[PDB]
Design an enzyme around this catalytic site. Structure first.
Site, PDB file in Angstrom:
ATOM      1  CB  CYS A 130      -3.282  -0.127   8.226  1.00 22.09           C
ATOM      2  SG  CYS A 130      -3.774  -1.259   6.784  1.00 22.09           S
TER       3      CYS A 130
ATOM      4  CB  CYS B 103      -4.553   3.917   7.761  1.00 24.20           C
ATOM      5  SG  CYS B 103      -4.686   5.097   6.260  1.00 24.20           S
TER       6      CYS B 103
ATOM      7  CB  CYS C  68      -0.721   0.044   1.520  1.00 24.07           C
ATOM      8  SG  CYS C  68      -2.025   1.491   1.265  1.00 24.07           S
TER       9      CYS C  68
HETATM   10  C1  LIG Z   1     -11.641  -2.987   3.675  1.00 25.74           C
HETATM   11  C2  LIG Z   1     -12.163  -1.701   4.810  1.00 25.74           C
HETATM   12  O1  LIG Z   1     -11.139  -1.479   6.198  1.00 25.74           O
HETATM   13  C3  LIG Z   1     -11.578  -0.281   6.407  1.00 25.74           C
HETATM   14  N1  LIG Z   1     -10.631  -0.418   7.953  1.00 25.74           N
HETATM   15  C4  LIG Z   1      -8.969  -0.112   7.396  1.00 25.74           C
HETATM   16  N2  LIG Z   1      -8.772  -0.953   8.873  1.00 25.74           N
HETATM   17  C5  LIG Z   1      -9.683  -0.885   9.303  1.00 25.74           C
HETATM   18  C6  LIG Z   1      -9.529  -1.309  10.969  1.00 25.74           C
HETATM   19  N3  LIG Z   1      -8.367  -0.794  12.184  1.00 25.74           N
HETATM   20  N4  LIG Z   1     -11.174  -1.201  11.512  1.00 25.74           N
HETATM   21  C7  LIG Z   1     -11.998  -1.854  10.767  1.00 25.74           C
HETATM   22  N5  LIG Z   1     -11.717  -1.271   9.272  1.00 25.74           N
HETATM   23  C8  LIG Z   1     -10.331  -1.214   8.826  1.00 25.74           C
HETATM   24  C9  LIG Z   1     -10.443  -0.176   5.400  1.00 25.74           C
HETATM   25  O2  LIG Z   1     -10.648   1.285   5.677  1.00 25.74           O
HETATM   26  C10 LIG Z   1     -11.684  -0.486   4.045  1.00 25.74           C
HETATM   27  O3  LIG Z   1     -12.081   0.080   3.970  1.00 25.74           O
HETATM   28  C1  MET Z   2      -6.608  -2.301   4.643  1.00 33.75           C
HETATM   29  S1  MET Z   2      -7.477  -1.176   3.775  1.00 33.75           S
HETATM   30  C2  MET Z   2      -8.061  -2.422   1.906  1.00 33.75           C
HETATM   31  C3  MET Z   2      -8.452  -1.516   1.082  1.00 33.75           C
HETATM   32  C4  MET Z   2      -8.120  -0.372   0.553  1.00 33.75           C
HETATM   33  N1  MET Z   2      -6.473  -0.151   1.109  1.00 33.75           N
HETATM   34  C5  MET Z   2      -9.070   0.883   1.559  1.00 33.75           C
HETATM   35  O1  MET Z   2      -8.351   1.166   2.819  1.00 33.75           O
HETATM   36  O2  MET Z   2      -9.781   1.350   1.517  1.00 33.75           O
HETATM   37  S1  SF4 Z   3      -6.110   1.211   5.783  1.00 38.71           S
HETATM   38 FE1  SF4 Z   3      -4.670  -0.028   4.962  1.00 38.71          FE
HETATM   39  S2  SF4 Z   3      -3.923  -0.243   3.265  1.00 38.71           S
HETATM   40 FE2  SF4 Z   3      -6.297   0.686   2.885  1.00 38.71          FE
HETATM   41  S3  SF4 Z   3      -5.465   2.737   2.687  1.00 38.71           S
HETATM   42 FE3  SF4 Z   3      -4.761   2.160   4.849  1.00 38.71          FE
HETATM   43  S4  SF4 Z   3      -2.398   1.314   5.072  1.00 38.71           S
HETATM   44 FE4  SF4 Z   3      -3.779   1.133   3.302  1.00 38.71          FE
END
Ligand SMILES: C[C@H]1O[C@@H](n2cnc3c(N)ncnc32)[C@H](O)[C@@H]1O
Ligand code: MET
Ligand code: SF4
Length: 258
Positions: A18, A15, A11
């Site tokens: 994440c 975030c 990625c």
């Molecule tokens: C696949 C979806 O999961 C969301 N996403 C990423 N990290 C987390 C988290 N810790 N908790 C819930 N949702 C999350 C992303 O923003 C995407 O919208």
């Molecule tokens: C772990 S999120 C995976 C989907 C994409 N990177 C988003 O944030 O929307």
């Molecule tokens: S939530 Fe994770 S995978 Fe989706 S944009 Fe953010 S860093 Fe990337």
């Protein structure tokens, strides 16, 4: 019936919460992914969602487009979706592959650009919200349904998004409670430590009540995600949100589900 294929873990964003982190750089050969997607079709799949990782990062989106076209044109799946941070989507992708895509969900956690930046939902230009708006217009022009996903966390739990969401008029606004997953965003060796982002169930419910006038809102509590969110990882193994299964490419869909 429905599956979230996190086919890549790489990625371009950072975030802090994440929950599907850059633990590998592995992506299957295209023909191998096609082989496993056909197995899923044969096992009864009707809805696929491409995720990651950032789906549009691999091969500048061309890898994703080929799999989207395969699912629609060869497998005849009636619902093919992508979830993306949006930052890497080129208009040319819509021209080349948009006819095969039903739904594009763009992740945007705040309409305060500075909040997105501080959360790591960006790559420096601090224009994530403005990009979301352009993607809305591309979805309209290329006849793809537009959805927005937001992760509700410590830094946006008190935000009022009513007017902003209604002006974007998405088909659905999917609202996820920030979720902790051990080994992903929790642990001394984890690539992310999301504890400081977490909110209580009461805080989450308060956010939902604040937005009860948004009829397209769909909540995804921690318990709902644990109960119903199934992951197919970059080796096409099945994972949940609570060791991985064997890959469906090795033992098949049935044995991998157990
Ligand atoms: C696949 C979806 O999961 C969301 N996403 C990423 N990290 C987390 C988290 N810790 N908790 C819930 N949702 C999350 C992303 O923003 C995407 O919208
Ligand atoms: C772990 S999120 C995976 C989907 C994409 N990177 C988003 O944030 O929307
Ligand atoms: S939530 Fe994770 S995978 Fe989706 S944009 Fe953010 S860093 Fe990337």
């Amino acid at each position: 019936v429905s599956v979230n294929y996190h086919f890549t873990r790489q990625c371009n964003y950072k975030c802090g919460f994440c929950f599907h982190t850059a633990k590998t750089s592995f992506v299957l050969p295209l023909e191998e992914a096609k082989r496993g997607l056909l197995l899923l079709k044969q096992a009864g799949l009707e809805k696929i969602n491409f995720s990651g990782g950032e789906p549009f990062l691999q091969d500048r989106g061309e890898y994703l487009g080929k799999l989207v076209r395969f699912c629609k044109e060869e497998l005849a799946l009636p619902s093919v979706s992508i979830v993306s941070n949006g930052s890497l989507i080129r208009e040319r992708w819509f021209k080349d592959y948009g006819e095969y895509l039903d739904i594009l969900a763009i992740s945007c956690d705040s309409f305060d650009e500075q909040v997105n930046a501080l959360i790591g939902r960006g790559q420096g230009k601090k224009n994530h919200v403005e990009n979301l708006q352009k993607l809305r217009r591309w979805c309209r022009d290329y006849k793809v349904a537009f959805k927005i996903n937001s992760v509700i966390n410590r830094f946006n739990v008190d935000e009022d998004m009513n007017e902003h969401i209604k002006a974007l008029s998405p088909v659905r606004w999917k609202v996820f409670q920030c979720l902790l997953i051990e080994g992903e965003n929790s642990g001394e060796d984890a690539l992310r430590e999301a504890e400081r982002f977490l909110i209580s169930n009461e805080e989450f419910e308060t956010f939902l009540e604040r937005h009860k006038e948004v009829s397209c809102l769909v909540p995804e509590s921690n318990q709902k995600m644990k109960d119903s969110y199934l992951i197919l990882d970059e080796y096409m193994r099945f994972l949940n949100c609570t060791d991985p299964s064997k890959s469906i490419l090795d033992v098949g869909v049935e044995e991998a589900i157990k």
